[PDB]
Design an enzyme around this catalytic site. Structure first.
Site, PDB file in Angstrom:
ATOM      1  N   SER A  43       0.784  -1.222   0.000  1.00  0.00           N
ATOM      2  CA  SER A  43       0.000   0.000   0.000  1.00  0.00           C
ATOM      3  C   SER A  43       0.817   1.274   0.000  1.00  0.00           C
ATOM      4  CB  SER A  43      -0.928  -0.001   1.218  1.00  0.00           C
ATOM      5  OG  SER A  43      -1.998  -0.890   1.042  1.00  0.00           O
ATOM      6  N   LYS A  46       0.381   3.739  -2.841  1.00  0.00           N
ATOM      7  CA  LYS A  46      -0.761   4.645  -2.989  1.00  0.00           C
ATOM      8  C   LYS A  46      -0.329   6.103  -2.976  1.00  0.00           C
ATOM      9  CE  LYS A  46      -4.137   1.484  -1.349  1.00  0.00           C
ATOM     10  NZ  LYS A  46      -4.172   0.310  -0.494  1.00  0.00           N
ATOM     11  N   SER A 103      -6.215   3.519   3.408  1.00  0.00           N
ATOM     12  CA  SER A 103      -5.638   2.461   2.586  1.00  0.00           C
ATOM     13  C   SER A 103      -6.719   1.704   1.822  1.00  0.00           C
ATOM     14  CB  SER A 103      -4.803   1.503   3.427  1.00  0.00           C
ATOM     15  OG  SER A 103      -3.621   1.183   2.731  1.00  0.00           O
ATOM     16  N   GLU A 139      -4.825  -3.246  -7.577  1.00  0.00           N
ATOM     17  CA  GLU A 139      -5.292  -3.933  -6.375  1.00  0.00           C
ATOM     18  C   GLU A 139      -6.290  -5.025  -6.731  1.00  0.00           C
ATOM     19  OE1 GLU A 139      -3.345  -1.359  -3.409  1.00  0.00           O
ATOM     20  OE2 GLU A 139      -4.082  -3.428  -3.539  1.00  0.00           O
ATOM     21  N   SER A 210       1.091  -3.311   3.925  1.00  0.00           N
ATOM     22  CA  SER A 210       1.306  -4.689   4.345  1.00  0.00           C
ATOM     23  C   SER A 210       0.882  -5.599   3.199  1.00  0.00           C
ATOM     24  CB  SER A 210       0.566  -5.035   5.623  1.00  0.00           C
ATOM     25  OG  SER A 210      -0.820  -4.945   5.422  1.00  0.00           O
TER      26      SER A 210
END
Ligand SMILES: [Cl-]
Ligand code: NA
Length: 259
Positions: A43, A46, A103, A139, A210
């Site tokens: 993440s 992002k 997130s 994603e 993570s």
């Protein structure tokens, strides 16, 4: 170095692979550990997707108000904000904040799609002078973090230098830079990572990540009390596919490099 030794000891004790880059803007000095190795960003990528949209908004000032439909077909694995807006629209500003502060993976995919996909986020990185960053996938698959796999990786050194450009440098216009920093300061997911290893009085803007193989990441801009800002990237990954996240390892790395 002595900090190097302590990071190696932490890495050994943790059982994984630890990558650290600290930029101290007071004297332009660096503390580096495995800083040129690749780590899955998860993440933390992002930030680059949000920055690419912010860059686009310099030329299209109403861009951030543009509305994006959220459909059931958009949901992925972790959509804490997007799921509240199914069958409605969110602005690109709301999606950016959602990606950075919660997130939200739908938000990330909508940011990616807007700028033209992973290759376009990567091209934006290249425009900034970051030849290391690569975003390959959307994603949720960009989080697989398979050892040896270069997809969706960067190095600590490159991410620290790029984050410095974005938050402390001039990569973005003043309004857009301020917005990025405001979003990152508002992150809700980082208290246990880099922040946990720093004094309570310091101000942190960060983005955690993570993923697979117990990958546990945090990238941060830090305003210490009465000191020039720091940039700190802590990437950590482990050998077992099902390894648990180790945010404590990032807190410990942060404490070691800022003592
Ligand atoms: Cl396992
Ligand atoms: Na990078």
């Amino acid at each position: 170095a002595d900090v190097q030794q302590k990071l190696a000891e932490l890495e050994r004790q943790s059982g994984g692979r630890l990558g650290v880059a600290l930029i101290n803007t007071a004297d332009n000095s660096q503390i580096l550990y495995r800083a040129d190795e690749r780590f899955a960003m998860c993440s933390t990528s992002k930030v680059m997707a949000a920055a690419a949209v912010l860059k686009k908004s310099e030329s299209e000032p109403n861009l951030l108000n543009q509305r994006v439909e959220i459909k059931k077909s958009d949901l992925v694995n972790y959509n804490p904000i997007a799921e509240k807006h199914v069958n409605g629209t969110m602005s690109l500003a709301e999606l950016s904040a959602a990606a950075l502060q919660y997130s939200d993976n739908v938000a990330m995919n909508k940011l990616i799609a807007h700028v033209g996909g992973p290759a376009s986020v990567t091209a934006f990185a290249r425009q900034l002078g970051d030849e290391t960053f690569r975003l390959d996938r959307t994603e949720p698959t960009l989080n697989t973090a398979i050892p040896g796999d270069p997809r969706d990786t960067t190095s600590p050194r490159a991410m620290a230098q790029t984050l410095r450009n974005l938050t402390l440098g001039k990569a973005l216009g003043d309004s857009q830079r301020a917005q990025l920093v405001t979003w990152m300061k508002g992150n809700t997911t980082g208290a246990a990572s880099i922040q946990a290893g720093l004094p309570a009085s310091w101000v942190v803007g960060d983005k955690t990540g993570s993923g697979g193989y117990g990958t546990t990441n945090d990238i941060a801009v830090i305003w210490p009390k009465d000191r020039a800002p720091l940039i700190l990237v802590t990437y950590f990954t482990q050998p077992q596919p099902k390894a648990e996240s180790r945010r404590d390892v990032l807190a410990s790395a942060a404490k070691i490099v800022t003592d």
